[PDB]
Each structure stands twice: as structure tokens, then as C-alpha cells.
Amino acid sequence: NGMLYPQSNDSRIVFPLDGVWDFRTAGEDSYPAEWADAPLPEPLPMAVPGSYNDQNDELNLRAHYGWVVYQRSFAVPSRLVAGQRMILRFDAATHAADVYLNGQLLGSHFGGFLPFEFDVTSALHAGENLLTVAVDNRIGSSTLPVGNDAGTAFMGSDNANVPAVAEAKKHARRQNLPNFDFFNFAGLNRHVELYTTPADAYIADIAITTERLDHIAGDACTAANALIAYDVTFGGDGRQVRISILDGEGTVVAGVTADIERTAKASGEIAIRDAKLWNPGAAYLYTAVAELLPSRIIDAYRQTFGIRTVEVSGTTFLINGKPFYFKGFGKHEDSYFHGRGTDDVLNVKDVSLIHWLHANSFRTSHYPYAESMYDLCDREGIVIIDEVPAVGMSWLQYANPLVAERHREAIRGMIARDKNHPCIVMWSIANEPGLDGDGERPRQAYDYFRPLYELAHASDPQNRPVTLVCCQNDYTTDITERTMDVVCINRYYGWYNLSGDLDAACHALNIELDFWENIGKPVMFTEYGADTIEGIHGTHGEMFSEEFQRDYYARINAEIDKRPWFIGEQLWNFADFATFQGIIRVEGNRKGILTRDRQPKMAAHWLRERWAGIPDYGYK
Amino acid sequence: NGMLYPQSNDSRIVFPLDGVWDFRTAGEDSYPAEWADAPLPEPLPMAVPGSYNDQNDELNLRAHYGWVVYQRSFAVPSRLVAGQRMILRFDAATHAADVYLNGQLLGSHFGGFLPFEFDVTSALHAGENLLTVAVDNRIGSSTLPVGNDAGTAFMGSDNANVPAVAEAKKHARRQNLPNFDFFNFAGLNRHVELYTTPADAYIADIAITTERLDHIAGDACTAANALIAYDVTFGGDGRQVRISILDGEGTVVAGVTADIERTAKASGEIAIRDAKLWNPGAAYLYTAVAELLPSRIIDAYRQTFGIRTVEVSGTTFLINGKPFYFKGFGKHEDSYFHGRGTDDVLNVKDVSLIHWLHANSFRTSHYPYAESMYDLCDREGIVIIDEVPAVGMSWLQYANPLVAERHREAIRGMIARDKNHPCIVMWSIANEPGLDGDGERPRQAYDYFRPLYELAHASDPQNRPVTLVCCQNDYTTDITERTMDVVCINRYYGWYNLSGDLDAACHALNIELDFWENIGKPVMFTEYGADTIEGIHGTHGEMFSEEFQRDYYARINAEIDKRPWFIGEQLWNFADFATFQGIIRVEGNRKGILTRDRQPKMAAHWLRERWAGIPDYGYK
Numbered sequence A, B: 001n002g003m004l005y006p007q008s009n010d011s012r013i014v015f016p017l018d019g020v021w022d023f024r025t026a027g028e029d030s031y032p033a034e035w036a037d038a039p040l041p042e043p044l045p046m047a048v049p050g051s052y053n054d055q056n057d058e059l060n061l062r063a064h065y066g067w068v069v070y071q072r073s074f075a076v077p078s079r080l081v082a083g084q085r086m087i088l089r090f091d092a093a094t095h096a097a098d099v100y101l102n103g104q105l106l107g108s109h110f111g112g113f114l115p116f117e118f119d120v121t122s123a124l125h126a127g128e129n130l131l132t133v134a135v136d137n138r139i140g141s142s143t144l145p146v147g148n149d150a151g152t153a154f155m156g157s158d159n160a161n162v163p164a165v166a167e168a169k170k171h172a173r174r175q176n177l178p179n180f181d182f183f184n185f186a187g188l189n190r191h192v193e194l195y196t197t198p199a200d201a202y203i204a205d206i207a208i209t210t211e212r213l214d215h216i217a218g219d220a221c222t223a224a225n226a227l228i229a230y231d232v233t234f235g236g237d238g239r240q241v242r243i244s245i246l247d248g249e250g251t252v253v254a255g256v257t258a259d260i261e262r263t264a265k266a267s268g269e270i271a272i273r274d275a276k277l278w279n280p281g282a283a284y285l286y287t288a289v290a291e292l293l294p295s296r297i298i299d300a301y302r303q304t305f306g307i308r309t310v311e312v313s314g315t316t317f318l319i320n321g322k323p324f325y326f327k328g329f330g331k332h333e334d335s336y337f338h339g340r341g342t343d344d345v346l347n348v349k350d351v352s353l354i355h356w357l358h359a360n361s362f363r364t365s366h367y368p369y370a371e372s373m374y375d376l377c378d379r380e381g382i383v384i385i386d387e388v389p390a391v392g393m394s395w396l397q398y399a400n401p402l403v404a405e406r407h408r409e410a411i412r413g414m415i416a417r418d419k420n421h422p423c424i425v426m427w428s429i430a431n432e433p434g435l436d437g438d439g440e441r442p443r444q445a446y447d448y449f450r451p452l453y454e455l456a457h458a459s460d461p462q463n464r465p466v467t468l469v470c471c472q473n474d475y476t477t478d479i480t481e482r483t484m485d486v487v488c489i490n491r492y493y494g495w496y497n498l499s500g501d502l503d504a505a506c507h508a509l510n511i512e513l514d515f516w517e518n519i520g521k522p523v524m525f526t527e528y529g530a531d532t533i534e535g536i537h538g539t540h541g542e543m544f545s546e547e548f549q550r551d552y553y554a555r556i557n558a559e560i561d562k563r564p565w566f567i568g569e570q571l572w573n574f575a576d577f578a579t580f581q582g583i584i585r586v587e588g589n590r591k592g593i594l595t596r597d598r599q600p601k602m603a604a605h606w607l608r609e610r611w612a613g614i615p616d617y618g619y620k
């Protein structure tokens, strides 16, 4: 179950496999398996990690459909592999992969945004090892994210009534047809590494939870006592594990020795006096150090955590008992050359921009992000809504068992990976699925999502609130969204409807707000905005102008400020990002308050000024 | 019936009333009648000729709905008006106008793009006269151009299924809802002037036609003989008119004296030996001087004309018996400050750009242009397709008698105004009306348009071909377009459908071309293109990039080059232009091969190179 990030210490070593690999395109539905047996013929270079799509301008890899094959060689000293458990880890391969080592099929994985690993202890040998990775970019009615099996792309234009169009369509080059509004970047998007653990016995998983806070200070910087719980899982094979809690200075402030009982597990509680709490804009991190005992140490893992509680109470969202207000945006892992490839420089910069903006949060739209970003937000005090790639879903998917299982895999996987991060305060199990309509459609959606809501709660030891991000729909026939712990709505009044009429947009908004006022749940924006080309200006700003984007947030935010039960504003988007091409996408999605190069539009400055005056706690 | 452009000579004088007028906005469906009786209170300045919408950044006049009121004073010497017929002419008031002089109602008008005039001989007085003009910008289901009585604008975004949206819309500020893709610029868009004629008898109209050419030279520069016909109409009351034909140097090369017969009218024929012909890229103009005889002259008018024939023969378009090929675009009267206001500096520049591009033609999409532009094209050898404002029409309009009458008014008005221009070779009676579908819809469309086709032929003494510009539709059920003299098609394969896939776009195009091949009419493009933001670049050009626009024309034009019956390529558009705001309009319509400031995008350079190698005559 556990997927702890690979760590180097006195018992463990990590060997990164990132760099410039060999690369070939393959077929729409196959690749030569014999490529795993020998070096790739006439290979291209391809940097790892990164999307492959924008790394070769001679080819049109954005138009590629089907398989590609990665390959490299590597060698490690025999004395290091000696007697160790050897694990090959892929942080992410988008969307599906077959992995070979020295011609042996290790196995396969579906899911483009979560890590997977293989025990390669027996497949390794001395000298050069040959690592071959086939990657499948194809999406469809059974994938998450959801693709279309025929027709158009998300908001795609057609003149189906023309006989000539209908015929040409049947003979067109086959392409991925996304039911989502972000480009299908594929490949080894995140790191690849080989790591070691002890073989006889090793720590397989660690879970830390904040169970109770006693007598929280007025400023919530401290609690008189904090009761935390640990749960350690072991693999391999009156054994014991030592748990030391390190404060921010490395001083051991608490420690217990727990017995391991066999599913080898050790669990218990630890009381910490005058515990320092983790808050938005004021992070504090402890380290839980677990050491497997035989004075010698068998195995060890250092797990960062933060002490904080999260509770939905009525129409309030309480972090350490204080009413929190979300200030932020949905993001994307998107940048010019890397595509969906992880880039720690960009992550560090983006975190600084969030502070510059005086935002305090974002959502991982529309997939779990690279693990390093959460670590970064843990230490920088930025709150996260963590979301699985369940985007583009409709009734066709709810009836599909493969989809249901892939959806369960993602929810359990995301939470298994991310459970220990204090910055994560809420889980999102889908973005804009079909939930409304007539007949049995609302009930069908509910019956699909309710067990996923329950699963997210069951999987998370911290028991954080669970939500589903709702598209702009008929909210009166939608019966699912209102049952979530927090109502998260995507609304584009004045952009996709009532276009350009801000008086009418605000009037319509207030009408839907009157509806939600009665539901009595806490409600927040997870999307709202307007496409905006930097440099377009007007004295009376029209759609696509910098001025209109500014006016838009000013008019909308003035309305939600009148609602005490309205607990957050996360806009769309942090920055312009790449999409499938189309008549409404001007070099991608331009709803960023920043450009793709992270430069601030007029609206960013206005938002920065507004957010500077809004406190993390007690705004409402 | 005649609306000769006002002329100054020894019998006639023109007094221009252009300049900076007084101006007030008024109500959605009324204005204060006393504003005609006295100076406007607290007036704004408003230059005229010009649209009013972009002349005041303190107001949002683009959002204005209903009436505005113009006013100025003027005074002329009594000795000039004495014994003269006094006429006040409005070259254009968009869309409807009520005109007052000195508190007296002169009358009203509805056509927004054609001239109208009043006899003010008796309403004028000595000293300052007060001229008040109320202008109505409203469009709807009975106007040409066509507006929507409710709902949305063109290619407009909606979420009607949301209850909040439905309610807000019913309370929204009233706005014009166009069924066309160009902004509803309104006001005194063209010149205003007072002119004089003799009172007792005067020249009211002149029509010149090329009846026959005998033995045209091999280079079509001359004909051994040209038979031209004249028709002069008189107003007022053995009278005679002298008709002198002047060549380009002012030399009298022919002269006849004709008897006036009573609708007092004189008509006859004149033979011109070794006549110099008017051709695209090689214009030649004569002047017909008509002089009403009492050695004294009663009245006189100089009418410019050019000697050329136009004939559709099979799948060829013959000018002076030679097979012509259209190279060009649809235009707009559109510019940054003037709006739809006429600007002869811009007209002169645009004409030089047409030469720069090596284009030879354009269409007056989607309304008759200012008269000065046709004079310009007469002397510069650019061919024109002249079009009435019948845009946005569908079955709702075909059943409305008021629309039918306004449509007949526009066709007769356009042809009465423009009949003498040699540069005009074809008439267009609509742009993209609804023609297709099932049941009686194709037949209903046919029955509406056939008598308008016949009317256009009956109204034009030169009997030029008549067309109707057809939208991208179901060409198999459309029964109207294939009966026009030239088939003019607007096609957006690869933009609005098969988006971004030029292979599939060309495949679909060729399928429709296979259809038109058998119809046996000459066929041309009147629209095709792709929105393009200057400065957006890619190695593999996607939609909105300069490269994609270039690739688009390159792939499409290669296909039509294979069809001998395809006699012209007029793209969309000459230059970026203003539209109603919406999610597919990035600061207006960006399908220009030039920017709104008339700067060339990449495609313009490519098109210039292609057109440089295509001759006006004999390409096919």
C-alpha cells in the first residue's frame, strides 16, 4: 500500500536514473517488443523527466497517437546491491507503461500521475543493465482522464450536417480526443530512480495523524498539548521500532519504543507538550524518525509532518479551530519546454509567486502533482486541495467497471502517497463530472460517487473533508454536490454565459447563491475567470482585455463578500497553459492571472492588493 | 429614383456640412421632440462623417441602445439660394433617421448604408439654420442587417439550462442582438451636404451602358467600335440635352444632341471608334457630360464611366471577352476611431495595399460602401462585387412583408446609386442566408430570393451577373445557390470544422468540389480563412498562429488550382475588424491577412507572392 519517497541514509541509498535517454516513436496500438532486448535503433534523445511532446520540433509529437519507447543503460557497483532489496521507481509515466529490464517484462501500470515500482532484485546483474520503457498516451471512454472514443475535443467545433465533413472525418488521422481542457502531455513526466532497503526487514509505510489538540493558543501558534498517532508498516521476513519526534531544530522532544506485531505493524500515540502548530502562512514541521531495531539500527526512515487539525463545522472550515478562508487558484503542471514534466525551479518560483500574490492555497487541478511540490508547500505554509485525474467523466463512464476501478486506484493511490502532508486539508474526487439532468441520471451519478466519497474518508487516517468540483450546471437537479463536505463550484457567469454583461452575471450569481444559502453547507469557488491576452487594453474593457479580467473579479468578489457561508475564492487559472487547439483557445488557455511565463496581468496586481487585506483566519 | 452624387459646376454648387456637430444620447425608443426646436442642451462634440460609438471614452457608446441626436447650425448667402432648388443630402445615416430643419420635420429614412435627400427650398431661411438629425441604431427581426429579437449574438455562448441564467437574462439591460459578425457601428457614418440645382428643369439621373463591343484588340486595350447607350432623366416643370463624351485627356471624341420626351427622359446610343477599354489592372475612364439646353446652359452634370462588357459564359467570367480570375477578399468599412465612418485616406491606402498584394478585386461585405471608394476603384482598376445589407436572414424574415420591401429597397437603391461604375462586375443580394434543410425550407428560401435575383437583373441597365453569397451548409438540399449566375461560397473547412486538420479539411473540400464540378456554374470563394494573432508563432503552426494561417491558404489554394471551373479566390478578411464581444472574438474578428492597422501577417506575404504569379486574364 505504501509509497514513501525514496530516501538516502545509513541503511538506504537512492540511484537517480534521470538524464538524456534514448527514444523512438512507435505504433498506434503496438511497439516492437524486441526493442527491450537490444539498444534502440537510430534513437532520438529525450530528457527525463519531461513530456516528450515539445522536445522535438522536427517531429509533430503533439499529434502523436499511441506508443513511444524510452531506453537507457545503467550500472552500479555490485557491493552496494549486495544483500539489498532493490526497487525501481517511476514517479510518473503518462498514461500507461510496460517496463522491461534486461529484456524481462517487469510489469505494467495504468495511471499517469501516480508513482509505481518494481522489485528488480533478481532482474539486475553486474555491468550495464538495459532499461526499456514503453509509454502509451492513448485516452478514451475507459481512461482517467477521460477521452472521447469519437467526435470532437472539449468544446470542439463541427459542421456535422455537411456530408463532406462527415465523410472526411471517417478517414482523418487518428488522434486522442480529450474530454478535458489541457493538452495531453505524455511520457516520463516525473523522476525515475532505483533505491535500496534492507531485505530481511524494512519500513514499508508510515502514517502520522494529529488526533487531538488541547488548549490551543489564541493565535494558534501553539497548543498546550498535542496528541499525535503513528502507524508504521513493515515488509520482509518481539521486534521493536523506535520513534523519535524531532522539532524544527532537530531536538528530540518526544520518543517511544513500540512493539511490532504481525502485515507487520506498529501503532500508538505520542503526547507533545507546547506543540508548535502548522498554519497557513506560518508553517512548522516536525520529523517523525522511525528506526527498526535489531545499539545498532536495522532500517530507518525520516518522515516530515505537521501538527494541525481540519474540521468542517456548519458553514465554517476550521484549521486548528479557527475559521479559514481560501485565497488562491487552480493550477497546472505546465511550462513551455517541459510540458507536464516536473521542474523544481518552476515549483520554487511558483511558490514565491503565491506569496507575492498573498494567496494561501491552490488545487491540484486536475491530477496529483509531483511529490516535491507538496514538500515545498509543507514548509512554505500553503494549503492544498488534492485532486485525482477524474476529469471529463459522464454517464458513459459510471457504467464502466474498468473506469470505476481505475477511479478507486487513483483515490487510494493519491491518499496513500500524500496522507502525511499537513498542507493538504481536503480531497477532490472529480472535476466537473456529469451530475444533473432528468430521469435516473442524477441518481446514477450519486450512486457512482457516494462510495468514492466514502472511500476517500476511509482511506485518510486524518479524515479530512472530501469534495467534488462541480461544473456550471442545473444545480436544482444535481443531487450529488450538495452532499459533499464542502461545496466546490466552478462558475463562469459573464464569460461562457451572459457574455460581457457583468450586471447580469452578478444577478445570476446571486440567484444561485440564494440557492446555496439554504443548503447550509460551506461553499467556495474552485474556478472562475476570463480568457485574457496580455497587452490587450480598453478604457471600457471588453472580453480578452486585461481590464475586463480585472473588472470581472472585482464585480464577482464583491458579491461573494456578502455571503458569510462563502469560505473561499480559488480562481481559474494561476497561469496560462497549453491545450488542444481550437477556436476558443488562443495559444492555449488564457484564463491565467499570470502569463505562461509567470508575468502578472492587470488582474494579478488587483488580486494581490485585495488578498493582502484578507486574513487567513477570521475574514468571515 | 436617381441619386447622383452632388456636383459643383457653373449651374450647381455643393455646400458640405461635415465637421464637429453637437450631440446627445437619447432613449431606448424615443427622443425629446423639443431638441429639434432649439439648440441641444449640454451637448457633446461629435465629428461627422463617423460612427459615434468610439468618439467618447467617458461613455460606453458601444453599449448604447436606441436613439441619439445630432445637431448643427449653418448659414449660406441668400444670393446662392436665390431661385435655386435646395437639396439636403445624407450619404448615410445608420440605421434610421428623422431629420428636422428649423423645427420643421423634413422626413425619415431607414436604410443605414444608402443615401437619401430632402428638398429644403422652403424650410431654409436667411441667417443661421438649425439642423437636427435623430439617428436610431436598433436592429431586430425586421431590419437589414438582421437583428435578434431575443437571445444571443453571432457564434454566441450560452448555458440556457441554468435557472439563474434564464432569470438574469429577462432583467438584463436591453442591447442590440445582431445576426451578423461585425459591430453595429451607428450614426452619421458618411457625408452630409447641401446642394443646389436649377429649379425649373434639372438633370435627375444618368445611366451609361456598354451595349456592344466590335472587334476587341488582342490585348483588349481597345475595340474597333464601342456602342454605348445613355439614359438621362429630368425633373421640374421641344427641349434638348447635349451629351459630350470626353476621353481621359478631356478631348471631346463624340457628341450628340437628344430630344427630351415626357418622367421627362432622353435616351439614345453613341458609337465610339477605337474606344479605349476599362480592364482590371488597366483602368480607362471617359466622362459623359450632359447639358440641358434652353449658347447658354441650363443645367449640367459630368458622369464618369468606363467601357467594358461583362458576361458569364459556361464556367467562365468574361470581361471584354477574356476569362477573368478573381484575386481578393471581403472587406469591411472598419477602422480604429472612425468605426464604419468613411475615411478616404484609408480608402486610398487600402487601394494601394490591394496593388501591393497583387489582388485585383473585393466584395463590399456586407453593405454598400461609401461612394468615393467606387470612384477610387474605377480609376485604379480594381474589380468590385457590390452587396446589399441582407445579412443574418432566415425563414423568419422570408415570411415578413416589411423585410421583403426593405430588401427590394436596398437592391434598387444600391443599383440606382452604383450602376455607372465600370469597376462593379457583379451584384450580391445576400450574405449567408438560410437556404437548406428539409421539408419546405429550401423551397421557401428559393421563392423569396428568385424574384430578388430577377429584380437585380431588371434594375441594372448593364445586366451584370447576380449572385448570393452562400454559407457553409448542406449543399445537397440547398436549391437556391446553384441557380445564381455565379456560385459564391463561404467555406471554413479546417477552422470551424475539422479544426486544425488540413489533410481532412482538403479531403472534405474536394468532396464538395466534386459536387460543384457537375453543377456547371462558375464557382468562386467569397470567404475562407482562420483567426490569426500577429506575433503568435510555431514551428508546427496551430490555430491562431501566423504559420497556420499561411499553411491554411497554401493547402486550400493548391486544391482549387486543380479545378478549371473555379474562377476566383476571395478570402476572409482583408483586415482585422471590430465585432460584438464574445469568446471566439479576440478583440474582434482576427481573420484579416492584415492587422486592423493594415500591417501584413505572414500569410499576406505568401499570398502576395502567389498572386504576383497569377494573371487577371487567362489563368484558367
Ligand SMILES: CCCCCC[C@@H]1NC[C@@H](O)[C@H](O)[C@H]1C(=O)O
Pocket (backbone or CB within 6 Å): A180, A181, A182, A366, A432, A471, A472, A490, A491, A492, A496, A497, A527, A572, A589, A591, B159
Ligand atoms: C460554464 C460551463 C463551462 C465551464 C468550463 C470551464 C473549464 N473547467 C475545467 C477547466 O479544466 C477548464 O480549463 C475550464 C475552461 O474552459 O477554462
Ligand SMILES: CCCCCC[C@@H]1NC[C@@H](O)[C@H](O)[C@H]1C(=O)O
Pocket (backbone or CB within 6 Å): A159, B180, B181, B182, B366, B432, B471, B472, B490, B491, B492, B496, B497, B527, B572, B589, B591
Ligand atoms: C462554418 C459555417 C459558419 C461560417 C461563418 C463565417 C462568417 N461569415 C460571415 C462573416 O461576416 C463572418 O465574419 C465570418 C466569420 O465568422 O469569420
